Structure 1
């Protein structure tokens, strides 16, 4: 229920070097046994820590802790809150909706209640991945939310394809895949009034340096950038994402989906494959062929191609 010690601890180990319990316990003022209890809390947070007789405690690889002012300096205005431990970055912005401005972001080292759609859970181990959320004020209201979801998918895919990710594709209308496994989850939440503006919170959970996953939280099948072959400074990659999304949406307000229609066709990881759609709880099946101009997924269930505006797509086993 109290996080200061384990945080101070991860700050120490964060350099990838050995710290003996004797030294840690000295720096921190507690018994060696107590220093191990905190080491144990870090392990619960998803931090991987080992011990080596003589040397001490270590991280398999260094961690580059997020630095607000560091990411801020690579930006054009905008505000960025960097949080050690949060319930959900999305929740964090939703709660601050009235003081926010478009493109404001919030990013955390660790989520204790990271979430997805349909009440699902999003595995968020400390410091291994990017847990980033950005706020946006869509002047053209809720009707524009889906197209917005599509722009985000296309943009993040682009930023990562330019860094080594070849087979990184998008999922209609949220999430990134690669070699056919959730590489990143995107959760767009919103409050609006039809005929007025929509307040939007975009949440992205990008799998980067993660090594092991908890089978009963992630049954699905996952993948990481680290397994793609890339090691991005989270601080660097957050910069590039906020920069690009802020510009891509500024542009989508001005031109709609139009400039993104073709880009979606190349990136759809599901264009032309046996899929399945879920509406509430009533199952429905078929095949797919891109989207239309208003961003609706095009579903051919037996010869005829009808467009659906909602639901969750997925390959069928």
Structure 2
């Protein structure tokens, strides 16, 4: 039941606040502005007006795999945006939501004590996109040519997250493998993964474990580490 909100006008980071405050699971902390945002395309643009920045607590004892989780959340984020805008979106392993070549959303997940802090940033109404990420990022406004009710968006997103997380629990990742893999970005293309190494080859798909399958010279390798980031090559 992700439907009750805590909407602030400015914080250092919704991630940090939930790391500090003791909130109940299933409640989303939203912030119009973030002075010390962290993750994805940087801190500078996470302080822009028009973006949708929020975080929420999940039970660590209940969502053990922090590789499939980001994918399911990303799948939930894209599904909500597609339902709203009726625009096709792609998923970039292992977390980002993309429209074509540029990112629209990113899923962050941290752990602290007995907390699983999930932070999600969505590009909705930012009008003045930074020149340094004009190439890698886009907004709902830029794509569709109109603004969107950030509250309406957040609600349908929280709903999909809720609905999908219930299935991911009751059932398994098998329920989303096909949905996710079929929306994967750079699929069939030459790509390069970096993090705890650097593997380069053709992204051939997604394993039932949520791992990225790369076709190298000596076989297809399955990448499970969340450390890795997937970029073109």
Spell out, residue by residue over 1:120-144, the C-alpha distance to the aligned partner (whole angstroms, 9 max, x if none): 53612443111121211143454x1
Show the counterpart of 1:224: 139
1:1-317 correspondence runs (5 A): 76=1, 79-96=4-21, 99-116=22-39, 120-121=42-43, 123-140=45-62, 142=64, 144-191=65-112, 199-216=115-132, 218=133, 220-229=135-144, 230-280=146-196, 282-302=197-217, 304-310=219-225, 311-316=228-233
Show the counterpart of 1:52: none
Q: State the SS of the aligned residue for 2:25.
A: coil
Offset at residue 78 of structure 1 (A): 5.5
Structure 2 runs not aligned, ≥5 long: none
Q: Is the 8 A contact 1:103 1:242 kept in 2?
A: no
Q: Is the 8 A contact 1:101 1:137 kept in 2?
A: no
Spell out, residue by residue over 1:22-74, the C-alpha distance to the aligned partner (whole angstroms, 9 max, x if none): xxxxxxxxxxxxxxxxxxxxxxxxxxxxxxxxxxxxxxxxxxxxxxxxxxxxx
Compared CA separation, residues 298 and 254, structure 1 to 2 (3 A): same
Equivalent pairs, count: 230
Q: Is the 8 A contact 1:138 1:253 kept in 2?
A: no
Q: Is the 8 A contact 1:136 1:200 kept in 2?
A: yes
Structure 1 or 2, whichever has the larger Rg, is: 1
What is the TM-score normalised by the length of structure 2?
A: 0.89
Offset at residue 266 of structure 1 (A): 2.0
Offset at residue 232 of structure 1 (A): 1.9
What is the TM-score normalised by the length of structure 1?
A: 0.67
Compared CA separation, residues 278 and 159, structure 1 to 2 (3 A): same
Task: Tell me how large the CA RMSD over aligned residues is.
Answer: 2.2
Q: Which has the higher contact order (CA 8 A, sep 6+)?
A: 2
The structure carrying a bigger helix percent of its residues is 1
Instruction: Tell me which stretches of 4 or more aligned residues in structure 1 moved more than 6 Å.
Output: none
